[PDB]
Amino acid sequence: MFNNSSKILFITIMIIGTLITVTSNSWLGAWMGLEINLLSFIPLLSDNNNLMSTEASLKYFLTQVLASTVLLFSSILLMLKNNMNNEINESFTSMIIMSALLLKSGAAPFHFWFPNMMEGLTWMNALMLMTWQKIAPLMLISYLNIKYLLLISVILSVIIGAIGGLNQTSLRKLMAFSSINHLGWMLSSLMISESIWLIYFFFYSFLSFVLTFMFNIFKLFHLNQLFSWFVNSKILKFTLFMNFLSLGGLPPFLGFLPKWLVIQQLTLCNQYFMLTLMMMSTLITLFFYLRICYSAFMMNYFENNWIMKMNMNSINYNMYMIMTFFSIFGLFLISLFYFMF
Template sequence: MFNNSSKILFLLIMIIGTLITVTSNSWLGAWMGLEINLLSFIPLMSDNNNLMSTEASLKYFLTQALASTVLLFSIILLMLKNNLNNSINESFTSMIMMSALLMKSGAAPFHFWFPNMMEGLTWMNTLLLMTWQKIAPLMLISYLNIKNLMLISVIISVITGAMGGLNQTSLRKLMAFSSINHLGWMLSMLMINKSIWLMYFSFYFFISFILTFMFNLLKVFHLNQLFSMFFSNKIIKFALFMNLLSLGGLPPFLGFLPKWLVIQQLTISNQYLLLLLMMMMTLITLFFYLRICYSAFMLNYYENNWMNMMQFNNFYMNLLLLFSFLSIFGLILISIFFLML
C-alpha cells in the first residue's frame, strides 16, 4: 500500500487533473484531465485498515472507465461530424456525452454505483468523492446545457436522494443519497444561473467537510454508533447534529442560504412545479436528518457514562467548533452584516 507522502503526491495530481479539465479549450483535453483525475484518485482509495477499499476501487474504476469510453466515443463523433457530410445528429451526440458526464458525477439515473462504493471508503475519501470529484464533470455539463436531459436528471436526482436515504442505517450511504439530492439542486442551477451553482457547491463543500471531519474524528460509521455515543461534551454533540440540519437546508442555519437563492431563481424563471417537487423532496431529507437528531436534543436522553473517556486534540477540536459555529450561525451573521450596510 502507499505511504502518506505518496498519497499527498496523488492528491496533487488529482487536483492538477481537475484543473486541466476545467481550463481546457477542447473536449479531448478535458477528457485527458478526467483520466488523470481518475487514475490518481484510485491509489488514494487504498487503505490497509479497510477491507472493502479494494472492492470500492474496482467498482469506481469500472464505472468511470465505462463513462470515459462513452465520452471519448461521443467526442470522436463530434470531431468526425464535418468529415461525414453532417450525417451525425449533433444533439444526439451531445446527449450521449452528457449521459457519460452524469454517470461520472454520480447523478441519477446513473447513480447506482455511488452509494455502494461510498460504503467501502474512509471518511476523507468520501469527502473527496462527494465534492472535489464532481467539479470537473459538472463544469463540462455546464458547457453542454441540454435542458431536457438535465431537467429529467434533476427530477430523478432529488427523488432518489430523498427516498434512498429513508431506510439507511449507514452514515456513508446516508451522505451519498444526500449528495445525490444536493446534486439535483446544483444541476437545476446549471440550467439557469451558473454563479449560484458555484455558490451552492461552495456551501455544500464547507458543510460536508465539517461533518465528515467530525465523523472521522469520532470514528462513527453507522446510526447505532451515534445513538450509543452521545458524549459528555454537549458542545460537540450539538455542533454535530446541528451541522446535519444545516446540510439539510433548515433555516436559520447556513445551509439554508444556497437553497434560498435556488428557490428565488426558480421562482423568477417560473419553474413552479419543479420548485414544488424539489422542496417536497428536501422535506423528506430533513425528516431523516431530524430522526437522527431528535433523540440527541432531548434533555432526558439516556447516555452511557463509559463513553466519557473519549479525548480529542484541542487544536483540531477548537478549529472544528469554529467552523461549526460559522455553519450553524452563518446565515444570522450574514443577515446582520447586510442589515448594517
C-alpha cells in the same frame, strides 16, 4: 493527507488533473484531465490496509473508465459531424456526452455504483469523492445544454436521493443519498445559471466538508454509534448537531442562503413546477436528518457504562467547530457576500 506522505502527492496530481478539465479548451483536453483524475484518486480510495477499500476500487475504476471511454468517443462524433467543438445545436451527438458526465458525477439514473462505494470508503476518502470528484463532470455539464435530460435528472435526483436515505442505517450510505439529493439542486441550478451554481456547490462543499470531518474525528459510523457516542455534557451533543439541520437549510442555519439563491434565480426562470418537486423532496431529506437528531435534541438519554472520557485530535477538532459556529450564525454575514449581483 490521512496516513502516509504519498497522500499529498496523489492529491496534488489529482488537483492538477481536475484543474486541467475545468480549464480545458477542447473536449479532448477535458478528457485528458479527467483520466488524470482517475489515476490520482484510485490509490487514495484503494487503501492497502483493509479489504472494503479494495472492492470499492474496482467498482470506481470499472465505472469511471467506461465513463471516460464513452465521453471521448461521443466527443469525436459530435466534433466530427459538427467538425467543431461548439455544435450549432444539441442533437443526438450531445446527449451521450451528458450521459457520460452524469454517470461520472453520479447523477440520478446513474447512481447505483455510488452507494455501494460508500461501504468501502473511509470518511475523508468518502468526503474527497463527495466534494471534489464532482466538480469536473459538472462544470462540463455546464457546457452541454440539453434541457430535457438535465430536467429528468433533476426530477429523479431527489426522489431516489431521499427515499433511499430514509432506508439507510449506515452513515456511509446516508451521505451518498444526501448528496444525490443535493446534487439535484446543483444540476437544476446549472441549467439556470453558473455563478449561482458555483456558489451553491461551494456552500455544499463547506457543509459536507465540516459534516464528515467530525464523523472522521469521532469515527461515528452507525446510528447506534451516534446515540452511544459519549459527550461530557450532552449539550454540545446538541450544539454541534445543528449542522444536521443546516443540511436542510432552515433559515437560522446558513444552509438556507444557497437554497434561497437557487430558488430565487430558478423561479426567475419560471420553472416553478420543478422547484415544487425538488422542494417537496427537500422535506424528506430533512426528515431523516431529524431521524439522526433524535440523538441530541432531547438530552440525558440511556448510554453505555464503560466509557468515562471522550477524546479527539486537536487539529481536526480545532478546525471542525470553527466551521460549525459559522453553520450556526452564518446569515448575519448577508452583507459579506457580494457575488450574487
